[PDB]
């Protein structure tokens, strides 16, 4: 068949990789540089820590955006059946289009969530603000993602 | 002179590019066939040890990143030097997260016989370990540096106060999820890979 | 010869990079914007909700590389042409190199505008008109890559 | 008596002196050198300027004769300006120099 | 055949040996970048 | 200074004009050299009494 | 070492600077405040 | 926060632990409900001072020799983070002494032209401004002997490049102008420093804690000018950084600032400096200002800027004490509350 | 071989590079000279939009970007020559990497006069006569566009 | 084999290279200094009209780009030789390398001369002397490239 | 099967199991001994208990020489791309988990033996900090010495 | 053919190109380094100006010295031209080109360091002269090399 | 085939980086540790013959190159296997990349020892123990070397 | 034997031995007129005594210049290539070597002009070690002559 040459899986699983690895990435540095934020004020009003969490879990569930979508990968995957060309490079594209929309969504809640958590502890006022540049700065990677699953599901 | 090599380099694959494109000869440039034909032991092999190689190197690099700074720290309070360990062993435990997935693959690692070498099956398994073991690598130095980061400012916090360092763990636990999803996804793409026959 | 099997490749880059370029311009928008944001509503409370509207306007950037990137993903085929992967690589290039631009221009006008809106009141309408042209450019980017998309799969054969 | 301070400089004594041996034979080339570049310097002028000046065509002519006194001062100024003052004076200077190395070292 | 100067063993022979140079060069830029604290050794 | 160009220009010029006359194969002797030798004689020669007008009007100054 | 340089030095630059027509030159140069080296001298 | 604790893990955490020590409002608290300097030794023994005035016993305690051993241990402190830095970071710790040794050379080139004793002109220095040829600033008068003589193998070297010697030796007029000016290209170049080579996080909250300085001493050096001197704006303008958050549109005004009212109206349009020049002591407002940015430099983790931020939050500390212990043996208490407390 | 099957690249990336290296021009135009209008306008905000024309003059060079890339994009073809994708891939160029300058030129200019207009008023007939000629690259490189896409389909065979 | 396909393609990149990079030399020459007359002028707005004279001579050499790119393409057929388009590609990149030079040396004495001609009303004279220095540059770089296009298509087959 | 090009991979992986396991043991040994020797110049009877971190980064480099020589006793000049890949696979694990061992006790080592002369209590402390990162150049040590075993089967 | 292919003529391109481009480099840098100089030392010493447009004249000769091998080699391009005819004239423009490169890099930095301190010291002026010329015979040499490769481009060519 | 033409390249470049990156880890650590020897010997010259020893036990890397280089030149032939060329790549590398570090570790403890050593005098022999560690990093290299170095040419065709 | 690719080889050692030793005397020349136009504000006596240093550095461009004409002189359209190869290894013996020996005699020019302003007898210092510092760049003059000695020497 050459339409389904054998070197096909290799974009696929690089589809994979790139969905798993820079999406973690992504919800690695939102975390980090957040947590720096929130423990900054660790001594100063230790009170607004347990409340100030929420961009350590919105930076979480960027890696389970990427994870959703390397399950839906890996699971089109298999040395018996056939394997086009058209859905490794669709795999290729569909992990490609969310790691880096994770990875950008996670710089935005890292810069985000780390100045307004740190700016927190003078105007208590903040948190709502907060949160919603937060939600639009998380939606960032819901776009990829919801591009990952309709490319997904065209390219197979 | 990086900028400059990587310049050079740029310039050179487009002039080459564009005169292999240019004489109609533009296919001869194939990576299709140069991943049909390179074999497939050595993506399985660089795989399996830049797994173990990636997941050490994120490991040690969290290990002194919050390292460093617990030692800093436990200067004038000597009372977070056993205690906030478990920062080290969070970052400890994406190494025997690769370790163990470096071993399962090389399970799969047997000798192929000549005749059937570059098949469907020997060139998939070769495939699915090599992005297998880079994206459980890379996940697990990514994790072991944002736990290391993670821990560096607990181990200060702990010092500033007692009642902080159970704060700040929650932020170790939402970091060190990602090794562990690296864990499960570096199992999932090698879980149909059959040994090379 | 015409439609070849590494074909898709081109459109599925396409697909990827109104979606990669894109969002990294979106996130550059929000993220140094809503800086200023969290540095000025310190002293300044009220204005909390009037100076979301850089972060507003760099999300729209991210829509309008949603857009291009499902409209493209609706047209990727087994058996395409290759200008059709060409153009729909060119749509996805004139999208995200431009709303990464837009990106940039939102990012570093917003954060200096609401840090000059909270010292002045009437700085705030200067401060919507520079964002409207600096969003244009991410609005001619999604202008170019629909009138190109559009020709894709118009008189393509074999 | 210092030992230390014969045999030290002794071996630096032996070492400069089997050193300089091959090396100022070498450095003497710089007599060759000098006289190539001025050699090909006047050649090379000569062919631009008066090489120029010489044709069997108008002759008697005002203006194939003020082509002759034009390229006559060009070449003139430029061999004194370079040829004498600011290339005698570097063979000069390197005749000075094979005397302050190479001859008063010995 | 993949090519005849830039064979199926040479690129992958140049591929290895362009990882292993890469960290070497990230190893040695590693160790370039160790000072030393004067300050502690100084009487002052 | 220009009466001493003027004279090394009657020299100069004086001599390279009567190795022209004389056929000399230092300047007529090549094929890249001018054929004709008491035609670059005649324009050489009128050039050196230029310069020795030259020199006569400069050396009384 | 500056009586054996009497010769060795113009002589070392000769083969460095060897033409009749710069030479000249620079020999007339030099006679010139040789034979004027009562008026330079005191100047 | 990735490549810091490469050389930097040891110095950050002790510097935080050193942070630790800060005293808070409650310690300052009870430390003017004290009746006695003994009293007030031993309430700062249970502190992280504790045991520093151990050599004294009560008798020879006066509050000169509190404000000189509780500087004394910031000093020693400050040593020793700094014996342990190596690169960036050890050239970062140059940089902050440099600015001592400005006020050390201006010190010791005043205590020649008043002819008092080198031996008493020295204990008066600043320990943290120490280069080895500082005694020997004792050796000529004017100017340019004692630049090229003493002040060439100093690191202060390239900060005489606008010090116009006119062959006039030193009045008390002129090394003040000498001091502002040295200064000022030390400003310049410490912000270089701090934009070229320090990283991303402890940049930017360490040109701000550097832009401040430079404001501070632009407006301290534009209000000092009225009552004691009287100069043109064309040299006063050699005077004021150029680094600032007041440099290109308020020093202009600052310059030609001939009245307080200048000074007001040129600080009235800046933002954040308004108000200042109305109500209340301007040096309780600028050290007010000092510490609140120097609260919100502790707050970004990975950062060099911290040992800025610790050791001018421990200066303020020792002003305070010394404040608090200045009212307890004077028997003043009417303002021993004016301490300046943000942690 | 006159009218390849890889001839549409260049034609795409001709489309493509006239509004992302023109709108990366634009953005910069826009946001260096927006920060200083945004830090100038909070003591001179009845200056608000007469300071605003280096924002106007920098996003006209993103509609010169925008005309050509329509006018290469409507210029496409599935089978077209190769000299067709030379020509447009040469006039993308001309428009983004001389509007990318232009627009580096009013965005340095720009915040230099807005900044200065506000003290000295006679400063602002001078930064609309430095502006013009900064603005005027663009023109020039859309000039240079347009007599070459004038040119693309002219004479073109097989 | 004289005409090949790919022919054009050096002189499409020829006639873009023309005006790009006397663009990017323009440009500096015009944003330095325009920053020199924006800072030397808000104090003595008098020399408003006479300091332009740098922001004019750095226009110039991008009409100098004009002028080569219009003639390059003017110059551009689907048949051309291989000849044509590299000499048109060396046209090219002669008024475009040498006309970012000159931007870069008149972006550079232009705010240099307009900062100093402030204090000194007798500097202005030597910047435009200068100046004339720099934009010959540029010149230079015309009179190559219109010389290469002379020769582009004079004997080609 | 067995090509020319074959021991180039399993000579290449021998080097780098030695070389990138030396260079981290000389990072290790470097760093932590500026620390060794700026702590003793105050207090010079911590001399011979802040020596462990240079020995752990020579049981590092002992690691690694371990591996080069098991993979030099098993090359040949007819083996397979299988034995050629798996010495390099065993060369490349050892060599970049012994590089991050030895960084990582370099980093950590100079900081505990400064820790160790202010506050006593925190030997204990970078001992067990220490054991840490000595153990993954013995993680990496388990793939090498695994992938050895599977050299000629 | 084989001594004289079809693709001859780049390497004479280039070399024509880079001779000129060079040398306005060069002579760029020796203009605007040793103008910052003279523009500088002006405003306290400005009867000295016709004097110090030294470094600025012996700079411009510079790029009369890229001018003329420019002239020369374009003089010289053929269509079926030698292959050794393009190499050296690349090899002549490479010649003149780069080393009046570093003769401008030279010819900057004296000039600037001499106007300088000849405000100062009036006995510098000629020995700025001085060095200059030392400065400028660097690429004196460059045009030498170039002339001498320009003789042989075709002398026995077949 | 088993024997190629280009084959000796690899054998000639581990011939030459054995002695070439020992001798740059020889010179880093002489330097950087010489360096510290002549500041630290204008104070206390009595103790200039013992901080000698970090620049001999460099200069020992230099002759672990040597030996190594003298043993690939002696095994080098024009008709070598390919094989022997690996083996002597890999020798050459071994011994050089892994002295670099040697060197490099010699030089960073040697001149942060003999500064530390004429303030306390007790921290001599803690120099010269971590020098040794730093030392036998070479010195494993070198066994590396040599085991591959006798396995070079033993069952080669 | 003798390709038609071989002048370029020839080209390449005729152009890098001006190039290369162009650079080292340009850069000789601008650190020495740096270290003169600096020390010679105040000492305009030993202004013509301080011009060694740049005398020094042209005579390594007339060391680039003499075997740049040497090659030029030996170019063909039918050399071989063993000649080109010989004539691009002379240029490049000449040239970088004259670039290190331009380096040597700039810094040290400029380190001994601005020091023997203060002491008269550093002069016959700087003189001594400038000549070390231009037999660097007449060794490579050396190995250039012995390499075009022999690139037409036994060539078929």
Same mark, same amino acid.
């Given at each position: 068949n050459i339409y389904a040459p054998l070197y096909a899986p290799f974009f696929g699983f690089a589809g994979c990789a790139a969905a798993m690895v820079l999406s973690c990435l992504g919800a690695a540095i939102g975390t980090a540089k957040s947590g720096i934020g929130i423990a900054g004020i660790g001594t100063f009003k230790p009170e607004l820590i347990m409340k100030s969490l929420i961009p350590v879990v919105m930076s979480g569930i960027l890696a389970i955006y990427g994870l959703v979508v390397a399950v839906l990968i890996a699971g089109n995957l298999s040395p018996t059946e056939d394997y086009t060309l058209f859905n490794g490079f669709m795999h290729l594209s569909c992990g490609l289009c969310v790691g880096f929309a994770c990875l950008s969504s996670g710089y935005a809640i890292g810069m985000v969530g780390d100045v307004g958590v740190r700016k927190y502890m003078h105007q208590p006022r903040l948190f709502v603000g907060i949160v919603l540049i937060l939600i639009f700065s998380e939606v960032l990677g819901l776009y990829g993602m919801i591009v990952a699953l309709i490319l997904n599901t065209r390219g197979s | 002179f990086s900028h400059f090599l990587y310049y050079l380099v740029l310039i050179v694959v487009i002039v080459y590019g564009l005169y292999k494109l240019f004489t109609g000869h533009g296919s001869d440039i194939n990576f299709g066939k140069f991943l049909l034909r390179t074999s497939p032991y050595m993506w399985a092999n660089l795989g399996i040890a830049?797994?173990?190689?990636?997941?050490?190197?994120?490991?040690?690099?969290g290990i002194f990143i919050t390292g460093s700074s617990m030692i800093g720290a436990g200067?004038?309070?000597?009372?977070?030097?056993?205690?906030?360990?478990?920062?080290?062993?969070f970052c400890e435990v994406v190494a025997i997260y690769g370790l163990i997935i470096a071993i399962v693959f090389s399970s799969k690692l047997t000798v192929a016989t000549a005749e059937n070498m570059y098949s469907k099956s020997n060139l998939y398994?070769?495939?699915?370990?090599?992005w297998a073991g880079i994206t459980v690598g890379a996940s697990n130095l990514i994790c072991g540096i944002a736990v290391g980061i993670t821990g560096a400012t607990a181990a200060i916090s702990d010092a500033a106060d007692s009642a902080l360092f159970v704060k700040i763990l929650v932020i170790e636990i939402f970091g060190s999820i990602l090794g562990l999803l690296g864990l499960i996804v570096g199992l999932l793409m090698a879980g149909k890979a059959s040994e090379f026959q | 010869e015409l439609c070849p099997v590494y074909a898709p490749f081109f459109g599925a880059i396409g697909c990827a990079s109104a979606i990669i370029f894109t969002s990294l311009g979106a996130a550059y928008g929000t993220a140094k914007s809503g800086v200023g944001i969290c540095a000025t509503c310190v002293l300044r409370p009220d204005l909390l909700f009037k100076n979301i509207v850089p972060v507003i306007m760099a999300g729209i950037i991210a829509i309008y590389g949603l857009v291009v990137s499902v409209l493209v993903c609706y047209s990727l085929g087994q058996k395409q042409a290759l200008y059709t992967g060409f153009i729909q690589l060119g749509a996805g290039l004139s999208v995200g190199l431009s709303g990464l631009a837009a990106g940039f221009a939102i990012g570093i006008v917003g954060d200096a505008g609401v840090r000059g809106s909270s010292q002045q009141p009437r700085l705030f309408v200067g401060m919507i008109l520079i964002l409207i042209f600096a969003e244009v450019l991410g609005l001619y980017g999604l202008i170019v890559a629909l009138l190109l998309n559009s020709r894709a799969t118009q008189d393509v054969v074999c | 008596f210092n030992f230390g301070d014969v045999m030290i400089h002794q071996v630096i004594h032996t070492i400069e002196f089997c050193l300089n041996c091959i090396s100022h034979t070498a450095s003497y080339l710089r007599l060759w050198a000098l006289s190539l570049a001025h050699a090909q310097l006047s050649s090379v002028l000569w062919d631009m300027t008066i090489s120029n000046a010489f044709s069997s065509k108008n002759s008697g002519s005002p203006l194939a004769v003020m082509k002759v006194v034009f390229l006559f001062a060009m070449w003139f100024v430029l061999t004194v300006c370079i040829l004498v003052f600011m290339e005698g004076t570097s063979a000069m200077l390197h005749a000075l120099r094979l005397h302050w190395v190479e001859a008063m070292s010995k | 055949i993949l090519s005849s100067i830039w064979t199926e063993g040479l690129l992958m022979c140049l591929i290895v040996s362009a990882l292993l140079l890469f960290i070497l060069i990230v190893a040695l830029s590693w160790i370039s970048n160790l000072d030393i604290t004067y300050g502690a050794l100084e009487k002052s | 200074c220009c009466t001493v160009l003027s004279a090394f220009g009657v020299v100069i010029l004086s001599v390279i004009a009567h190795l022209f006359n004389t056929n000399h194969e230092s300047f007529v002797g090549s094929i890249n050299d001018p054929e004709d030798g008491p035609a670059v004689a005649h324009t050489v020669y009128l050039a050196?009494?230029?310069?020795?007008?030259?020199?006569?009007?400069?050396g009384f100054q | 070492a500056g009586l054996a340089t009497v010769v060795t030095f113009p002589f070392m630059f000769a083969i460095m600077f060897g033409d009749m027509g710069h030479g000249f030159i620079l020999f007339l140069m030099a006679l010139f405040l040789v034979l004027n080296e009562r008026k330079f001298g005191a100047m | 926060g990735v490549y810091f604790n490469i050389d930097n893990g040891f110095i950050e955490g002790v510097v935080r632990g050193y942070r630790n020590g800060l005293l808070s409002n409650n310690q300052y608290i009870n430390l003017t409900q004290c009746d006695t300097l003994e009293d007030?030794?031993?309430?700062?023994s249970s502190t992280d001072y504790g045991n520093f005035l151990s050599s004294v016993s009560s008798e020879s305690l006066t509050t000169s020799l509190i404000q000189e051993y509780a500087s004394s241990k910031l000093y020693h402190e400050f040593n020793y983070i700094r014996d342990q830095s190596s690169g960036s970071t050890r050239k970062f710790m140059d940089y902050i002494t440099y600015g001592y040794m400005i006020d050390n050379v201006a010190l010791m080139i005043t205590g020649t032209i008043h002819d008092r004793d080198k031996g008493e002109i020295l204990q008066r220095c600043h320990p943290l401004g120490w280069f080895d040829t500082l005694p020997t600033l004792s050796v000529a008068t004017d100017l340019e002997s004692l630049y090229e003589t003493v002040l060439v193998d100093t690191p202060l070297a390239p900060y005489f490049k606008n010090c116009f010697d006119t062959a006039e030796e030193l009045d008390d007029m002129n090394i003040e102008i000498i001091r502002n000016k040295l200064y000022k290209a030390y400003l310049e170049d410490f912000y270089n420093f701090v934009t070229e080579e320090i990283p991303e996080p402890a940049k930017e909250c360490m040109q701000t804690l550097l832009g401040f300085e430079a404001d501070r001493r632009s407006i301290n050096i534009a209000l000092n000018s009225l009552q004691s001197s009287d100069i043109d704006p064309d040299l006063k303008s050699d005077l004021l950084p150029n680094i600032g958050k007041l440099y290109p549109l308020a020093t202009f005004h600052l310059a030609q600032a001939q009245d307080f009212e200048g000074v007001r109206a040129?600080?009235?349009?800046?933002?954040?400096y308004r108000g200042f020049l109305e109500t209340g002591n301007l040096e309780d407002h600028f050290y007010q200002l000092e510490m609140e940015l120097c609260r919100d430099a502790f707050?970004?983790?990975?950062?060099? %800027?911290?040992?800025?931020?610790?050791?001018? %939050?421990?200066?303020?500390?020792?002003?305070?004490?010394?404040?608090?212990?200045?009212c307890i043996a004077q028997n003043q208490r009417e303002r021993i509350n004016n301490y300046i407390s943000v942690y």
């Open positions: - | 830049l797994c173990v190689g990636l997941s050490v190197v994120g490991a040690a690099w200067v004038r309070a000597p009372r977070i030097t056993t205690k906030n360990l478990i920062s080290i062993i398994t070769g495939y699915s370990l090599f | - | - | - | 050196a009494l230029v310069y020795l007008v030259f020199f006569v009007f400069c | - | 007030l030794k031993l309430q700062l040129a600080l009235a349009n800046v933002y954040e707050t970004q983790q990975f950062a060099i %800027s911290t040992v800025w931020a610790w050791m001018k %939050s421990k200066e303020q500390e020792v002003r305070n004490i010394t404040w608090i212990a200045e």
